[model samples]
Target: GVFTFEDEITSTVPPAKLYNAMKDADSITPKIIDDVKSVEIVEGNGGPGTIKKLTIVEDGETKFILHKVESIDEANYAYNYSVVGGVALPPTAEKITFETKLVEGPNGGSIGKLTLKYHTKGDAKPDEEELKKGKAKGEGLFRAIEGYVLANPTQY
Candidate 1:
């Protein structure tokens, strides 16, 4: 069987607020990370087949690029995205699917679980260390969103 990693975080904000914030991925991502240069939507609007180009600053003076999407269930707060293309990283011939679920939690907060299912093309598989780093980076992205929501509670 293949190994998978999931990360969850509880926030004081409601699911509706988080869903709204996620709908505006292009605007929110850049605002959350300084290294993220921009997020451009190439097609569709918060629906399947929608593509986004993420320009990222790498190595201080270098730039990297990645493509993703706006797909999956919106009402349930779930979406899937993949790295269509990128630089400064391994040649990813496969796609990564990311999904998030927001559920009611104790103390009037909400809990979000993020799951990633990746399919690699090559014979090699990601090691534990690589998986850990990937998970950490994914968590950091979500944390940035959480921080933004905390800073602008009424915006969403």
Candidate 2:
């Protein structure tokens, strides 16, 4: 089955700031997540059409995932990526696409809007509880990054 989920995260940081940071998502993502071991660009240099391996280390065991940047639109501040393969990739998801949009918020800061598409196997569909939990975890990642960006004032 197919399912589409949408959510938004608002920040007091400038829209350009968030946009610039996300432009190089692969490089910045590891810094945001505490358990992330490393993010290495396995293929294409971390740009559109590139492949990257995201390593997560927890309890002394490490797992990795493969991600592909489908497209990036700098002018519009949007991008899409897929979890092509990986042991760390969510098991319930057969195929998943992550789309994000950075927009100017009403207060002149930034708003990160996310779109998650799920394609599950057989009768599997995204569970609301699971999705909520995932997003909550995802939001913490963003919050940490935002705090980092704000504190540094010049880097992603």
Candidate 3:
């Protein structure tokens, strides 16, 4: 089974700041997000088809995830990636794909929209509770990045 979810986040941070922070997330995520321990590019450059290994700590447990960059549109602030492997994936899932786009808001801030697709194994479907938790986690991460950008001022 496959399930799709869409979410949007609005922040006072500018689009450029939000986009740049994500563009260089390999370096910035570990610094700004507590759960993230490290990020390494295992294959390809910082472009399409690039594979990244991300280490994170959750509830004192260290876990990792492999992210494959599918496409990146810098001019439009759009990024597409997939979770190919790792403990981050649910047992019933084959892979999870994510598409994110950042656009300027009316107040000179930014509006980021996220589209997530879950590819499940066999006839299994994604759990609603887990999906809710995932949505909350993603929102929190965005808020954390927003706070970091606002606090740093000069830094994205």
> How far does residue 35 in candidate 1 sit from its true spot (Å)?
0.7
Global fold similarity of model 3 (TM-score): 0.89
Candidate 1 lDDT over residue span 86-149, tens digit each:
6523454365556678777687667889886656666457667666656776677667777788
Q: Give candidate 2's error at residue 63 in angstroms.
A: 0.8
Give the CA lDDT, 0 to 100, for residue 77 in model 1. Answer: 76
**Global lDDT scores for all candidate models:** 0.69, 0.75, 0.83
The digit string of per-residue lDDT tens for model 3 on 80-131 reads: 8888888768888887878888999999999989888888899577788767
lDDT comparing candidate 1 with the true structure = 0.69
How well does candidate 1 match the true structure, expressed as C-alpha RMSD? Answer: 2.3
Every model's TM-score: 0.84, 0.85, 0.89
lDDT of 2 at 24: 58
TM-score of model 2 (CA atoms): 0.85
Q: Pick the candidate with the highest lDDT.
A: 3
Q: Regarding lDDT, does 1 or 3 come out ahead?
A: 3
Specify the highest-TM-score model's number: 3
Clashing pairs in 2: none
